Amino acid sequence: HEFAELFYRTYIVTPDQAGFQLSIRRNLVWEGWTGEGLSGEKQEISKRNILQGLLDYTTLETNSTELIPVIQSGENDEQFIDPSVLPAQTVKQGKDTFDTNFLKFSENGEGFNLLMLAQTPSRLKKGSMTFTDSLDSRIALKQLLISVTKGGTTELFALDVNRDQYAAYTATREYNFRLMQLKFHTSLGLGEESTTVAGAESALLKDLFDLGYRIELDVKVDGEMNVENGNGDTSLRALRLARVFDKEGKEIALTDSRVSAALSGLTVTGVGYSLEARLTNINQLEMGLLIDSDVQKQGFMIPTLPPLVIVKPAMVEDDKTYPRLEALTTAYRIQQMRNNAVTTLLNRADTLKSYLGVGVPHPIESNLGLEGVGQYYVRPYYNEATIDVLNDLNNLTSAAKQTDIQGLIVSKINEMVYTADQLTGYTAALEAAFSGRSPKPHVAIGTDMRLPQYIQINGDDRTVGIGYDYTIARISDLRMKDKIVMTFILPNESEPHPLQHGVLGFIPEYLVDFNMIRNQRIGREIRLTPRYRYFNFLPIMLVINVINLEEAIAQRTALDVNETQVTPAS
Amino acid sequence: IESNLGLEGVGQYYVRPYYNEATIDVLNDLNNLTSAAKQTDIQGLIVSKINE
């Protein structure tokens, strides 16, 4: 039957093997190893599939060569800004947790030796930092902390000074051959929407901001750095409010009453800075990211089933007391092809409801209880919706109700397919599974006898959207009362492939006919022993509930007119 | 032009700098008369803003 065929393609099996065994490949990215401590514990192993990095950005992004200042209470505290101004922030590098903060500006003789100040525990366990270690050619200012004060209120500012025209250290030959210099003179602006580091719009500049004005800060800062031994220093040399502009794009002098009054009482002082520095590793002390692969294999077995019988006396061959064989074949075909398939599909739907909620996808290999091995390769996903036809219809003329309903259903279906494709990554899975073809995701559509008189469209182009294929199969079972089911299918593979919804293990069976003495009674019997089962692979399923379609076609429906508020109420 | 020494960019020595942003709250901001033309109206609304 069509409905059974569409969701689970028949995969014939020669009747001498107990089932079919699947070998699926995988490629893994995973960092570090075992090797910690000294005990009898079993430890653990971390494994991340690379396809997670295809959607999320953190699986494949990691930094092991950054040099982040680390606070230690009582011996490296002086080089850091006062904790009272800004509390320490915790930043994680690899497996070490530590607190960091901006470096205090040097006055006249204070420095900082970045190599021996960025000692994280991971580097500590390896010994003293090797003299051969060198800093990368790129050194740059990451953030400047700038304090604006007026009357006693302090608001800290985190300006992203990185990626500015002169935030990058340059090569210079005046003193040494690997001494890097920073020469940073420009104007730093604070726009009319600029926010503080403490959240929300600033309040110390309300006067200028109300008139839409901005402020240019004259920032001119010099520093030097030696990438051979980490000796370097930085000292801010000026910060001053310089000009004022308006929203028309022209300068406004400070001699006017408004500008002078608004700028009065403002004091700006240098607070700190941060550095983007990567240790150019030459010693190879880094694991980076590893790429390994292992194999997973699953077993599937094909059972036997209770038999169907026909009885008659062994003097008898008729049509009524002995119905022809055709009836037996039809009963077999029905119980095989429709009832079991529908019930297993509904159980699959209920299980997917229970395990994954509604509308919330889980990552790759996030469950091991879900039947099937497609879960190893794509995100599991589930979603529900309800179409209230009495509420969702906007006609304009009673003679076009059919087209309106028809398009309403098609639009919801198309949107659902698009959302599933977006949240699942299914298209990327297809493009990875086969190279040389770019197969459009083929979508199955199944329902009872009622709806397929509305899913088609004759007058509007959209059926599943331009660029998707589809196939509708109608099933007579009453359990499918006004229900819509969708799944992703590829009708090009005749082998169990972990990217199709399901397979139907089929074993051909031939009837047996003999005389049998059943408890001292004599009679002729006919047997048919079926052998099959339905296996589910893909953990992606969509179900749509449609109700109240009956009333809308006959009940007066016209518009939900949004009288969008032009009469005094707001 | 050339008024901004801040921010990275060399092309700002040739063209004025400009940046603006608009958001579309589709739900209450759209025109339909028939459910048969929902998607076309939605498509037109976004294309209009892209033009502007």
Judged on CB neighbours under 10 Å (0-12, 13-18, 19+), A366 is: middle
- State the amino acid at position A395 in one-letter form: N
Q: Shortest Cα distance from A143 to chain B (angstroms)?
A: 14
A-chain residues near B20 (CB < 8 A): none
CA proximity to A371, closest of A303, A294, A299, A429: A299
CA dihedral A511, A514, A519, A521 (to 10 degrees): 120
CA proximity to A67, closest of A7, A8, A136: A136
CA proximity to A139, closest of A99, A91, A175, A171: A171
> How far apart, in whole angstroms, are the C-alpha atoms of residue A549 and residue A388?
8
A240 contacts: CB under 8 Å, gap ≥ 6: A217, A218, A268
3-state helix/strand/coil string of A343-373: HHHHHHHHHHHHHHCCCCCCCCCCCCCCCCC
Q: Which two tokens stand for residue A504?
A: 């139907």
Residue pair A289/A31 in contact by the 8 Å Cβ criterion: yes
> How far apart, in whole angstroms, are the C-alpha atoms of residue A274 and residue A277?
10
> How far apart, in whole angstroms, are the C-alpha atoms of residue A203 and residue A242?
20
* Closest Cβ opposite residue A163 in set B4, B8, B36: B8
**CB–CB contact B8 A164 (8 Å):** yes
CA proximity to A298, closest of A129, A73, A535: A535
The whole-angstrom distance between residue B41's C-alpha and the CA centroid of its chain comes to: 17
A304 contacts: CB under 8 Å, gap ≥ 6: A529, A530, A531
> How far apart, in whole angstroms, are the C-alpha atoms of residue A47 and residue A56?
15
CA dihedral B9, A272, A159, A142 (to 10 degrees): 50
- State the amino acid at position A388 in one-letter form: D
Please give the C-alpha separations between residue A497 and each of A399, A455, A540, in angstroms, as whole numbers: 48, 30, 15
Interface of B with A in 7-46 (CB under 8 A): 7-9, 28, 32-39
Interface of A with B in 551-570 (CB under 8 A): 562, 564
The pairing of strands A290-292 and A9-12 is unpaired
Strand order in the sheet with A532-536: A9-12, A502-506, A532-536
Which residues are paired to A297 by β-bridges?
A23
**CB–CB contact B5 A187 (8 Å):** yes
- State the amino acid at position A299 in one-letter form: G
Q: Which two tokens stand for residue A117?
A: 């100040």
DSSP at A552? H
Please give the C-alpha separations between residue A442 and each of A7, A303, A371, A486, B24, in angstroms, as whole numbers: 12, 31, 22, 10, 32
**CB–CB contact A393 B33 (8 Å):** no
Please give the C-alpha separations between residue A535 and each of A230, A360, A375, A504, in angstroms, as whole numbers: 63, 24, 14, 7
**CB–CB contact A164 B35 (8 Å):** no
> How far apart, in whole angstroms, are the C-alpha atoms of residue A94 and residue A120?
10
Q: Which two tokens stand for residue A246?
A: 């308006």
Judged on CB neighbours under 10 Å (0-12, 13-18, 19+), A455 is: middle
Residue pair A135/A279 in contact by the 8 Å Cβ criterion: yes
**CB–CB contact B38 A564 (8 Å):** no
> How far apart, in whole angstroms, are the C-alpha atoms of residue A327 and residue A319?
11
A123 contacts: CB under 8 Å, gap ≥ 6: A129
Other CB atoms within 10 A of residue B49 CB: 10
Residue pair A387/A413 in contact by the 8 Å Cβ criterion: no
DSSP at A339? I
Q: Which two tokens stand for residue A255?
A: 């001699």
**CB–CB contact B8 A393 (8 Å):** no
Residue pair A341/A3 in contact by the 8 Å Cβ criterion: yes
Please give the C-alpha separations between residue A507 and each of A309, A462, A493, in angstroms, as whole numbers: 19, 41, 19
Which segments of A123-282 are extended strands (E)?
A: 134-149, 154-160, 170-171, 179-190, 214-226, 231-245, 267-280
Residue pair A230/A178 in contact by the 8 Å Cβ criterion: no
CA proximity to A273, closest of A347, A332, A188: A188
Please give the C-alpha separations between residue A312 and each of A473, A515, A522, in angstroms, as whole numbers: 39, 10, 9
CA proximity to A443, closest of A324, A544, A305, A560: A544
> How far apart, in whole angstroms, are the C-alpha atoms of residue A335 and residue A332?
6
Chain B residue nearest residue A459, CA to CA:
B36
Q: What are phi and psi of A311, to 5 degrees?
A: -125, 150
A-chain residues near B39 (CB < 8 A): 411, 414, 462
> How far apart, in whole angstroms, are the C-alpha atoms of residue A550 and residue A399?
17
Query: A529-566 burial, b if ≥16 CB within 10 A, otherwise e?
Result: ebbbbbbbbbbbbbbbebeebeebeeeebeeeeeeeee
SS3 of A69, please?
A: coil
CA proximity to A542, closest of A408, A430, A447: A447
Please give the C-alpha separations between residue A434 and each of A6, A428, A430, A473, in angstroms, as whole numbers: 22, 10, 6, 27
The whole-angstrom distance between residue A129's C-alpha and the CA centroid of its chain comes to: 39
> How far apart, in whole angstroms, are the C-alpha atoms of residue A12 and residue A32?
45
Q: Which two tokens stand for residue A35?
A: 């090797």
Question: How many CA atoms lie less than 13 Å away from A559 in the CB half-sphere?
Answer: 8
Q: Which two tokens stand for residue A218?
A: 């004259």
| Helix-then-strand count for chain B, H and E | 1, 0
Other CB atoms within 10 A of residue A208 CB: 22
- Helices A401-424, A426-433: crossing angle, 10 deg rounding: 60
**CB–CB contact A406 B36 (8 Å):** yes
* Closest Cβ opposite residue A400 in set B28, B34, B38: B34
